[model samples]
Target chain A: GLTEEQRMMIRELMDAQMKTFDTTFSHFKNFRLPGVSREEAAKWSQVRKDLCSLKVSLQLRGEDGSVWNYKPPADSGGKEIFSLLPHMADMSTYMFKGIISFAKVISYFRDLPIEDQISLLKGAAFELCQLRFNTVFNAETGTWECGRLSYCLEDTAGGFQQLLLEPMLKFHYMLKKLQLHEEEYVLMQAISLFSPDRPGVLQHRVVDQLQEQFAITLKSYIECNRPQPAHRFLFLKIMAMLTELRSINAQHTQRALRIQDIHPFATPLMQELFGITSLTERHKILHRLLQE
Target chain B: GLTEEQRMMIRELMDAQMKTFDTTFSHFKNFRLPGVSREEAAKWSQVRKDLCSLKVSLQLRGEDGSVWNYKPPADSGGKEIFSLLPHMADMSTYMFKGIISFAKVISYFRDLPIEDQISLLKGAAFELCQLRFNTVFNAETGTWECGRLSYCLEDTAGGFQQLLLEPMLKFHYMLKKLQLHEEEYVLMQAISLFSPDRPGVLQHRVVDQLQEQFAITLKSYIECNRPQPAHRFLFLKIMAMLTELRSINAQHTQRALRIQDIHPFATPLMQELFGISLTERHKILHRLLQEGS
Candidate 1:
């Protein structure tokens, strides 16, 4: 178990990571599909799976750097665990491989206690697989598959890192300026429940808090707004995450419920829980959730 | 059980209806959406729903114009009961309630037996709801809702005789070409399903079917022209309509099975025994049927 403060900090960490995931996915959605070689398609597919895998990893591990209830770095391997904390961790091929290891963690959650399973799956589904496939596909391929990417994340890891680091660094700076760490944690946890490994720790909470502080800020700054399914899905995800918070873990329950009270009408698929291995298992979980 | 002759006739009825549904959905898909309205949305939504309901009704009533182990029109309300052919009976409302109704149907399947649920949900997830929502919303509004003045089929509810006369008068020489009773059923079902009671019967089918049959004549069409998710959803919808021939009566199952067997991957989904709806049921249905249910 973590301290309330520690748990809150972890939420901030997850929020930051999720923002990065969203940006990456948004970039992919803008991709155009045309004729492409099999090799190119294969390459794009692998990279996308890797990105998706990264999200799955963050979901299972939680931001506390724990896996299977064991402290990480000691439990997994020698190096510092992968954290969106930038300088706190190193980025390498091994890190990507570590991300893939999460499939096992997700599988493990399949048989856990009900509340724990729902909490974990909610984290995975809302946070990682935001159901933004079209956005993630980027290019239109001949088939349902997206077109090929010319470059791989491996070859361009540095560019990928930079792409993530710059905006994130700015976002953290904003959070530091706002000095709303507790508020940020609560809000980010609410938001991060939907996005997998979002980056820019302060982005979501800051905007939301600012909106609450002054409604005009939202109407004026957020211009030429196109409706997004992602946004709707995220809202749904937050509600589920909050429900899991309220029911299973008392610590999470109070925090999430508080958030929900303020954001009424965020009722998601009350029964639907994400991250189950099969559709049957997922449906079973949803039925249980509704019963509760 | 119905006779083999009746089954064959049903297959022909299905093929004609399938062609019409495909062509009309394709046409509606191309309709513009920028200037759409709530009323238009309500109208088109109904038409799509009515089409699916009609297909479902056929499952219970059978294809030979006889209810499965149930009474015929005379036992119920005479020839007027025959007008209760699911798709045609609900024509007026199909224009207004289809999309959301399709969503509900997808939801209903999710709670059904597992095997029956998964296949349908998969299609709904990948194909139906997955289509560019704005595209579907706009096209439906423009085609069915906006054209209400010219396309209302609700006025002719007197009986099948009155319904038959309206199209015959509008179609003139084309009506003469449909000699067989089965051919007439096919024509009526097609017009009711596609274009939602549009004028001109036999000639329209002749022209439309010819164009469709010739459109993908090349063997390389499948190999070279892989469809996008949008097009795939539309195809799945047509496939769903084709599957109904099996559900209409016991006699048509073999032929339905044959039609289903060709697309092995999609066959299990097409077959009654294997559909299982899931979280994204609508999307999966759309994926399988080439259009959303």
Candidate 2:
């Protein structure tokens, strides 16, 4: 019952959403760590203090006369490296926009409870960010090229290597071997969003149904386009990619916990999403985050 | 629609099958590798030849007096160490029975096409094997106990220490910490069997549906039994265990390939399961018994 026009519309919307995400990240495209130079280091140190300060308001005025605002409380500082907060906040906000835009296009998502929306977003936002990051990832060189800056996959400014970068890149290399279509990418993003296993979901059956619909749609799309004996294999490969994404996210959460332990300060959003909890709650959240 | 009696029946069948597997493996329980003694090494060499030989039959008489038979071609001799063949064969046979028994209990499996049946079996047999292996696995000692013999998980005669045993045991340690119920174990087995992402499955929808059915059943089971708010979390923990199981299999396959290169004479079953293509196979087999050629 699906038509090319409907398919094209989804693809076009996905591309538009991706473009928005790219634009949101444009500020960090050529952004370099201040560790390279004394002057830059001093400037970065001041920025870190400002961003981490509870009283400081991190407001940026865009060329289009748009305003971006994030304010931390003066007494809210954690031991977390000060400079990392702004970068995390900026990335998290952009990721939130991309997810919102994608949800708007999907249609069924808006019908769900707002609580469910927040729950799913909180659960899977990081996974979606990594999936988008994988798009521009260079598998051969293990570099992420954004704008004019080329970073080794392990080269995130605050020593992300110590936190599972090796495993992440290893998975990325495996993913790079697959010749995926743009539709597969979009479907994967949808699948990640509709995770039935996400903790605190008010209506898991509804979430599951949505995930199943996307999967069925993706399978039908694959058959229509490829129509080979290997079509099923291709679908399974995509599913495996999603599983790998979940595993990476688990490692990501572990790393976040480690960073939280060392440097206590986090943006309000980050704290809400990845905050500390009882062992029982931690396992519950971990289960949701890593659900395939 | 599943009654307690029905669930209990399935569990009993599972336990019975596991017992049968254990009995079948009892012969090899204390069977030690012939690494230390020359005489024992010679005996092992002959045993390997007999097992790998096409002319000879590897047969066993069960306690019920039923006969089990497997015959290889007379001229088919690879340079693989002979002692390893029986161990591999015993383990594979037990795994096959476990799968077949579980399939017999699950009525939907028979409804699948024969090709689909084989496809799923091929894709998941190793994974299911590891899950069962983990049950008897003693994480505290890193030993896999079967009957009288307790082999260290890291010991693989030819030194398979480098082959992900440490990682495997680490995972098992984590899994052991969970107090999984019998129903959970049985459900996990069924879930592992109906994996939708097994490569080469023809009917993804059917397989996916089967998996979803088991998942819902498990979910309901957890709710009824535990009735805790953490039931969903418990289910997810079990699912994550399966994911970790798959990752370990991936690593195991990679490690096995590396070992195969160093020791080219892996058993025929091992070859069939993890072998490269014809040229490499021929090279590995040809080099065996033809060292002077």
Candidate 3:
């Protein structure tokens, strides 16, 4: 039930999102380590705030089924339930986010399923309690600030969550549009760079996601007489981006790297979704279109 | 007439004489430049005297066609003739010994047939006078005593007469060896360096000599080409020797180059000649061989 219209919209969003990020990241690149000048730091500080606001906008749009959630409801759900579900889903979205957060501590997404990877991201967005866990755990307030904690923790927990979702959505749509049942490992590897905490676990999750997504067993994934070209291409692109980011991180302050630059991994994916011609406009559109 | 016996004797004598000169030159190379210290300068001064003696010996041998004159000649060229020739050649030979004196001078063996270059060395062995004209003309008799005529007259006419023989001999050998027609400009260039009187003339002579010696010319001598690798290598060999003598030359009065403790170009040439493998051996041999050779 993957529709062309939904595919186009997800691509459009990714195209828009990557352009904004690339611009924001470029500002970070100018400052040498130890850090930037106070003025430049303040400017970057503003960019991070803007990016945080955009992140929330993306989550909100994402919860709206991103136009793709309109695939006819499953047997257990009706239109009425589906209508209420986006709000209900947002409640547990944060809880699923906590699970992904906790999973990051365990293995980045190493042993997770594609649906689980998506579900974890989906759950983080919808669940209020899970979102609450993202707070700084202030002793005096005994109460978490919703927007502030989300903003503060996004570079680590929420940053990765956004990274996973952006690629997952684009890849899922690509597969659905192409009517391809190629392994999900390729898609997972691309998204793995988003999981910054445990690189090793994220890499392992790549293998698992592919096996589960395409319904290919581990043996079949490995022992396929010939590799599928499109799938191999996708995996190579991910690994290459990961290597690039790894090199960039070694050179840069990780704190600057986290939010300041377009994740080197996401740039190519954005190009694929928007095509080269629309990339600049797509960035402009994202800056103009999304408001927190 | 390419006689084997004459060729063999020339070969052996030239080899010995060249080797002796090479050894003597190495002693000067060991001396540091802008020389300092009485002891260091005295040592080099001794080598200069030794070289002067060798010139006399070579001349005697070349005149008589004797083999390898190391000992005092049986006749010693009769002291009267030596006295008659005056000390101009003796002074010139002493002042001009070793490579430094020839620094600006071009040795134009370029177009000469190799046999002629060899023959020219034989002729030069006999006739090359070591005269320092300025030093001789200005010298007081053993002390600072000078007659009134010395103040009035500048050029010592007899000294010039004797000194004039240098160019004549140099030209005769050069013309014979180089086999140049009257059209060629080589003799003019050689005379310019080997004989200059005025200060301006000396300056031009020095510049021309340096330019020609280091110049890229078609006709190069066998030995000139022997240190063949490149100019820098040969140049550095001289400099390294100077560096070693840096301390020794500091103590000289009327300082001259300390020719010991310094590296000579011949050291490297010999190292290459003998296939010596180690740098330490090369240096040791440079110092050690000079003492004996």
User: Cα deviation in Å at residue A3, candidate 2?
Assistant: 4.8
Error of 1 at A59 (Å): 31
Instruction: For each candidate, give its TM-score against the true structure.
Output: 0.17, 0.36, 0.16
lDDT of 2 by residue, B152-219 (tens): 43233334343333566566666766766756766777787788787656788999988887777777
Q: Write the per-residue lDDT of candidate 3 for residues B243-263, one digit (tens) a residue.
A: 322222222211112222321
**What is candidate 3's lDDT per residue for A159-185, written digit by digit as tens?**
444544443222223333332222323
lDDT of 1 by residue, A174-257 (tens): 333332233233343333332322222223443344324322222221222325443434333334533443332333223333
For model 2, residues A215-276, the per-residue Cα lDDT tens digits are 87777778778856866688888888888888877766766665555455445456657755
Candidate 1: docking tier: incorrect
lDDT of 1 by residue, B120-215 (tens): 232222122112111222222111212211122232344334543432122221222222133333323222232211122223443354324322
Per-residue lDDT of B111 in model 1: 33
Q: After superposition, how far is residue A15 of candidate 1 from its true place, in Å?
A: 28
lDDT of 3: 0.28
Q: Where does the lowest 10-residue lDDT sum fall in candidate 1 chain A?
A: A66-75
- Model 1 scores a TM of 0.17
**Model 2 reaches what TM-score against the true structure?**
0.36
Kindly provide the TM-score obtained by chain B of candidate 2 when compared with the true chain B: 0.63
Residue A115 of model 3 has an lDDT of 33
Query: Candidate 2: lDDT over CA atoms?
Result: 0.57
